[PDB]
A paper describes a structure:
Peroxisome proliferator-activated receptors (PPARs), composed of the α/δ/γ subtypes, are ligand-activated nuclear receptors/transcription factors that sense endogenous fatty acids or therapeutic drugs to regulate lipid/glucose metabolism and oxidative stress. [name] forms a multiprotein complex with a retinoid X receptor and corepressor complex in an unliganded/inactive state, and ligand binding induces the replacement of the corepressor complex with the coactivator complex to initiate the transcription of various genes, including the metabolic and antioxidant ones. All four coactivator peptides contain the consensus LXXLL motifs that interact with the activation function-2 (AF-2) helix 12 upon ligand activation, whereas the two corepressor peptides contain the consensus LXXXIXXXL motifs; we investigated their positions in the cocrystals. The same applied to the interaction of [name]γ-LBD and the SRC1 coactivator or the NCoR2 corepressor. These structural findings support the idea that the agonist-induced formation of the AF-2 helix 12 induces the dissociation of the corepressors and the association of the coactivators.
We have succeeded in obtaining 14 [name]α/γ-LBDs–SRC1 coactivator peptide cocrystals and aimed to obtain more with the other coactivators: CBP, [name], and PGC1α. Next, utilizing the same seeding procedures and the [name]α full agonist [name], we obtained the [name]α-LBD–[name]–[name] and [name]α-LBD–[name]–PGC1α cocrystals and ascertained their structures (respectively). [name] bound to the same loci as was previously reported, [name]α-LBD–[name]–SRC1 cocrystals. In [name]α-LBD, the α-helical LXXLL motifs in the four coactivators were located near the AF-2 helix 12 that was formed upon ligand binding, whereas the IXXXL portion of the consensus LXXXIXXXL motif in the NCoR2 coactivator was located in a position that interfered with helix 12 if present. In summary, the coactivator preference of [name]α-LBD was presumed to be CBP >> PGC1α = SRC1 > [name]. [name] coactivators demonstrate varying intrinsic biological activities, including some enzymes, such as histone acetylases (e.g., CBP) and ATPases, responsible for chromatin remodeling, and proteins functioning in between the NRs and the transcription initiation machinery, such as [name], PGC1α, and SRC1.
Author numbering:
A (entry chain B): 683 to 695
B (entry chain A): 201 to 231, 237 to 468
Amino acid sequence: NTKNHPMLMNLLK
Amino acid sequence: ADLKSLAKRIYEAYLKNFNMNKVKARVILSGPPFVIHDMETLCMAEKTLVAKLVANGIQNKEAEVRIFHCCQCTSVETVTELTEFAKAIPGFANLDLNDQVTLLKYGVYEAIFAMLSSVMNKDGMLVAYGNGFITREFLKSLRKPFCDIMEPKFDFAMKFNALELDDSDISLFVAAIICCGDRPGLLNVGHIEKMQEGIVHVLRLHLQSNHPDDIFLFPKLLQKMADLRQLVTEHAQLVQIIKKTESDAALHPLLQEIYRDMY
Ligand SMILES: CC(C)(Sc1ccc(CCN(CCCCC2CCCCC2)C(=O)NC2CCCCC2)cc1)C(=O)O
């Protein structure tokens, strides 16, 4: 769930 | 598919993305790092290794809360290293981003506690980018609940270390931890299960090659994965108790995001 994990999303981006 | 080559790519990604590897840690743990074995040496180590933390400011917080803050910083750094490693695992970057997030959320602490074994011996652990060593007895001496955090990790580590794995093995074990198709809430379960089967097969063949003396090493490692899931579920419960009952122990936002709705 990208919406609930913006900080992990940013690391992945 | 070239499984020796997949193993090598994963090993190279692990050497590239983690600042600490097992050969390095053993070079240091032989012989020098600054030894934290009591409150005097904790305070000296803070002034040499984390100077900003105690340049006034939380310098007046309890030693346990200062240590806990430093541990949160280290976990934040390790999650970043694990994310870079995951992106280099063949196939991970082709997954849906929602699934990449889910696999990281559930896998990172299992991988952290596996990798923590490489810097532990029965007397303590190498910390601060190889520049400090904090004794197991010092950690047990902290007030509750903070003395309860590390001891189960040392217990896991002593038996994990007895398997005598090297970095070529551990890299594949960490990849297998991450590429797990039974995490809650995956979208493309079948794709992830096939990726898991592939990584696990790479691990099985590698252990046959690298550890011909130990015919049970693969099922031993499957059991260690299950032990790590349990260790993380318990750790998450303890972190919840700390965050809820200790006001100077608020969680860093990246860690809160990982633990939120985890177990
Ligand atoms: C932070 C929680 C909320 S609880 C938790 C989780 C993990 C740990 C182990 C942290 N640590 C000691 C870091 C000790 C720093 C030292 C303190 C004394 C003054 C000098 C600096 C360390 O070396 N970790 C390795 C990193 C290399 C790769 C493997 C892991 C401790 C507590 C979390 O769940 O994240």
